[PDB]
């Protein structure tokens, strides 16, 4: 820890160091929105009841699947006022803005991966 | 239903008004489909075509059995009281079937013409079947008896359908039927359609005697209990002198059921 | 027929009806020329908005500029062209970042046609209504021009005309094109003649047309737009030539 | 207003939500259940419609427990009843897991009511069809009773009745003095009520299930011992002339 | 969702009318009167009295757990009107939003921000084709250290506003007309005057006599910013002092 | 054709017709069943054609045991030789690609019988309503341009609401109403169409409303607390069988 | 009183008033549009024989192969749709080879029929399928218990058989087999 | 006939109020074969019946295996049977691995009901079609728990859910007195006699259409088939009449 | 029409029914007028809060952005606050990078793209709103108008809103360029007067100028002074 049970499409990534975290501010930056949402969900589930996290997360799921196709930039106008970051500009949009992506994948491959078919 | 997220779904219709409203290139496709779906009579004498069945000869009794259970009942009970010969059958191309529609002729007094047709006629071929079997204006002396079986989940009542008793017999008789009924008649909320209804409607509108018999069995696969339940039928003038050997017929019916027809593998 | 509610269903004869209907959307836009000459590659246009309360804007409203040489012209629903032009600029710049050469035509036209078609196979999104017309130069195939399609059927056209009244303009262009020997001035005169032949015959003016060229000189491809006063004398010369028909 | 009664997220020209009202009506065709609070305790009772004698005591019951000092008397669709009981168990478990002591009744009732309301807001899940009672007891707060309607109602009742035979039960319960009584006669009153309102042309077998929590059990929910149940049964049977 | 959106000009939220009106939200507006209530909130110059109505369907139901006057923050109230099953959720949502704001900026919220947040999170439910616009009337109350007392009202559509007096319920029109007539006469007010005006408006709109224990009153004052609910004694005293 | 129940066929000389039309909800069929049950009329003959799906059943008007044992074909007629009223009781769906011959045969029989008036009761889809149809009553009327000079003044006095043109009429869900109207516009046969917007599901109140709306003009009943029209004795098990045991 | 057109065959998960899930029944009905096949189980091995029905003479005879290897001792005869059968065969091969690698022994025919049926059971709601597999297989082989021949239908079962046809005119190939089977005749 | 619009899916309530899909599934489960579920003080016999696709083919499996102390039957759809027995086996194995005691039936059946309750609410899913007759003795005498297409399980003493079985129920209720003190042989004889009523007239129970399975005090759950079932099927009197 | 009821399908002539319906909806709103002059721009509009029960403070229409961009809606009230917040967030996002204020054109393009993004998708309605925005960059005044589908125009004297055809006809014979704000404000007031259904009051006009100082919004007493004059 998985065995094999196309290398040109995905290659040149040794197994050595993905199970070896980089500079300690790695798991607190690669996964930040997920961790903040998890903490808020746990707090609400503990103090307010079991209805609020279920309702809010299923609202997230409902609003998530109306954006443009993955191979184009997503405006994400909605889901933002609902998340609570409506005006909380920070080190997430001014640095390496995804609109000007330096590298871009194939459309069919990206959409079929987003669907999870692969 | 909803093919993808957010798609607007039209409410399914009930009356049947969803149908919409030509150039020569489309003009022929309809006729090809109609000719393929058209019904023709192919009485197996020598690739015959035949004019109607009752035009070439008259008869007094024209009992017709529709459904596999009824065909089994007629082929088990009334076949040994004489010898029968085949006069013809029919060919159909309904999308639900194709299994035969062969008629029978008794070498004795030919007033009896018991029929066996388990094929499922479509919702439009029935009128053509009536046109090609009877005609336009037959005699006013025939008596018609129909035996059919329907699923038990059709009878409507205040009590639970499952809680209802074992399969029973119900009858529907026309106005011109002096003979009495051997079972209670069907209640008002229940109706019957398709070929038995077409036959009964034709008999009623052409002022000839008729009688209908239904069986509300809970199992559609052929068996012994349901076909044995048809016992009280053999006590009327519609079919009285055609029964001559009960126990041997029961034995041959048991042997026929022993053949173990291909059941459904969806269940256990 | 009834088989046109969603853009994922075929027909008994066999056809995608939704994209066929979307093909008619580009039939309600201004005409677009773009005949190809020996030296330059002229590209005319048309400005539908001719109201009296509109202020001028840079680089007209149709002709764009992709990276350094290639331009484009749009047609149809203009609300969906600002996204395509932006993404096409992005793909050109991304290719330049990858390989340090100016992009050829194919690796741009095919790249955009890929997305344009991909929105016609994942039902739940209407296809783009556009008729983008391309233009540019490279060092592998000289000068060439391409014309796109909402479904995606790009072909290396030498002279075409998208938009309304396309049939008559294309036919008369086919009947009056001097293939092989072609000059920039003669190409411009032919474009003016074609524009006068089409349209509602309003005699045109400097407030109804836009012209872009691609003269390549001094080893540095440039794109220039003719001035407002740079076409009035051209129209006057064409009118004089037309009136000089002699006859009797 | 037929036509708009096909999804939860669809109003009506009058303004009502028809799926919710259909769920309201769908709980009526069931058995009946009542619950009364005395001065220092509560008590319930359900007419368990016993099917053929193939079953036995301890069959599908409608007197679940949610904690050491709370319990319900749900009367409706049984699968949704079990799901709601599990949800309430999980809620009380979580509260005790980190906040100490035991959950007050009001908070648990509010949480369960809001959870059961959460389904009628979306076009993905059907609303719950079931009534719901959550009587319990405390040491200092006293004895409290709550009823939760399928959609959103979480009112607090002195004593009510849920199920098919409900109007007659309410009318008969109206004529009581359930503010200065004890837990030794309200049981007999409940038995006489459940036998004064019980149809016999469509119902054949009965088995009363009773449970009380109060000072007699110092804050614990359990079924009544068989002796008291039998005595109440005999008294109620002999009371009918 | 594998059920689709019902076809029709008024059967779903995301379909525009031929003339351009959202019929579903109009049905939502009509849905408040279905329950049947009336609420009046009047602001004077140093008080923000709120009056409402209480109806007991029967006798068995307890009279202490049927209130329609909840508490949002330490010094903000609400007079929620309409379907209870949706106000009971909007109240929790507002409480969570207020707690989050206090955690993120460290002071009590001005009423306008809470109203705007509620309006936005209610409006976001009127675009996705999976939601139902929950029908309520979010009427706020409270005092501010920069502008004094304030009364704000919100609607299921999401359009909020600032009112010097508000009536919400099944008798909105005549109550609003009466308040409009009364406000234009005199400008100054006081706690007793505001309470008497609210009670008189409610009585003249319902055209019925008010029992001493039928109406609850929640107020906030400059001297006592803490949100408090008038007891039975004070309401009875004011009712018997009225018209005497 | 029209097959009489008896040996001979009684002749209808100028009799008002009450034939229904298939549409969504079977509103017309339910209303006309109510009319037949409340007028206490009797059967005089049968209508036989190879267009309706064949179906047979017991007597739908089994008031007592005297007439509770009879057959009932899909199409049958009724009459009342007191005020010139005859009605049809179509109670089956139409076989596909057979509407036109049935309409032609029925119109031919209407012409041959020499009747006075014809009245058609049908319905329409409710969701296909423009904004002008919202804040208005759903009840409406439509008449061919041959009955105006007779009862148009009375209809205007009743203050009814006319159809909306386009320029041809198009009412969705009519099924056969458009066919009857169109093939009557050229045969000089007069009839009135009284439809009502409705949605599928439960429609008994809408049937009652349509019956009352028709009575508002025909004055079939006493001129005008709800026990006016007698509900037929066949409307017991509308929603199938009873509740299965142990489910609740 | 009235006859109404109600359809329940549209929708992969819809129960008809009396059961009998219509979509699976239609999938089973769709098998007959294919090629006939036969298989006889005998004490000294099993035999298969599957027709080909070449469309044109130009088509290479070995291009189409209903018979297909699964392992050194298991063979099966597909019918009906082709691509779905190819997918099933690929999954079966992968599964049996993986099991051989793991437990280091040979397959048992029931232990692979169970696996393939479990895979085919996933019809319903992730590269999950959306329609029943309109195919049919006649697994055959020899194991420790002897020679066995398993039949697997599209829906869910792997009933053991001795001689059972699968293609069109199955009645003619079934009645005659019933009339001729002897359970002790030689392989020749 | 006012049901076409309210039965196409499962998340809609009829105006009367009842999920029609649940009733349709409960009607569907009646397609199969009878299965008696008798029990005693020490042993819980589980006798089933087997159909036949044809004379040439072999019969289906109706008595699966779960663990050393529990064995289920099956009736109805054979598709979801394996999909549910997988969950059975996985839960039993997890309970044996984490703790070190056999998982009691009373929690296993509740877990199965909780799992089967999920699909009846969310869209795009259908209820299961099994008729399980879970049997097994763990610590407090053998139990016989029934499962329905709806997630509403019953406790039981003896019943025969499945195919035509009302006569089987009547016979099982007539003689429901001696099942508390008998040896294994007498209980098996009673089970086979009860099953014989289901089989049509002039038909006997051969060796190839019975699947007697027995679990009791000191013997693990074992399934009997082929000639091994002959010793139990010896006396059986001579004929029902 | 079956081809209607869904914004993802083209009618068999070439159009989008939902987009045209939303355009008609935003046309059926509140009149608004914008005038561009050689010195600056003026935006004038009126509110439906006629009754004295409402308040002058709190809710407000012409919300400024940063210091040089100001807008005004003529559509659905609760359906542009989110758009305004997004516009301000975009302005700040541009301001952190490129340490110099947003030019108008980039903001117009970005807001137009984000508004259009709810057209091409499937299952969400388009925004019912159409807003003008005024800017002042490089010593030049800028005026633009946005459409529900999204297509910016370099308009000069648009009077879009309720009864906008009459406003356009009236404005097509008064504006002549080379004007200061003093005459432009009077012209805008006259355009509003042409269609107001009543007389202008002290609390019915929300004019806001964008001269070379910022985006000052005229005080109510100043509006009274201009209205009297």
Author numbering:
A (entry chain H): 13, 15 to 18, 29 to 141
B (entry chain I): 2 to 22, 30 to 58, 60 to 107, 119 to 288
C (entry chain B): 3 to 250
D (entry chain F): 5 to 245
E (entry chain G): 1 to 244
F (entry chain J): 1 to 166, 177 to 234, 241 to 264
G (entry chain D): 1 to 125, 130 to 192
H (entry chain E): 1 to 241
Copy out sentences from the published article reporting this entry, exactly as the authors wrote them.
In addition to mature CP, detailed analysis of the cryo-EM data from the higher-molecular-weight fraction revealed two supra-20S structures, referred to as ‘preholo 20S CP’ and ‘premature 20S CP’ (right). The most striking differences between structure 5 and preholo 20S CP are in the conformations of the β subunits. Fusion of two half-CPs coaxes the proteases toward active conformations. Overall, the structural similarity of β1, β2 and β5 between the preholo 20S intermediate and mature 20S CP is consistent, with fusion having a major role in driving autocatalytic activation. Interestingly, in the preholo 20S CP structure, density corresponding to the propeptides continues from the β2 and β5 active sites. Although the resolution of our structures precludes precise placement of atoms and visualization of water molecules, the preholo 20S CP intermediate structure shows features poised to impact these facets of propeptide maturation. First, the β2 and β5 propeptides make numerous contacts that impact their orientation. For the β2 propeptide, these mirror those in structure 5 and include interactions with β3, β4, α3 and POMP. Meanwhile, residues 52–59 of the β5 propeptide retain contacts with β6. The α-ring is similar across structures 2–5 and the preholo 20S CP structure, where it is largely occluded by elements coming from both directions.
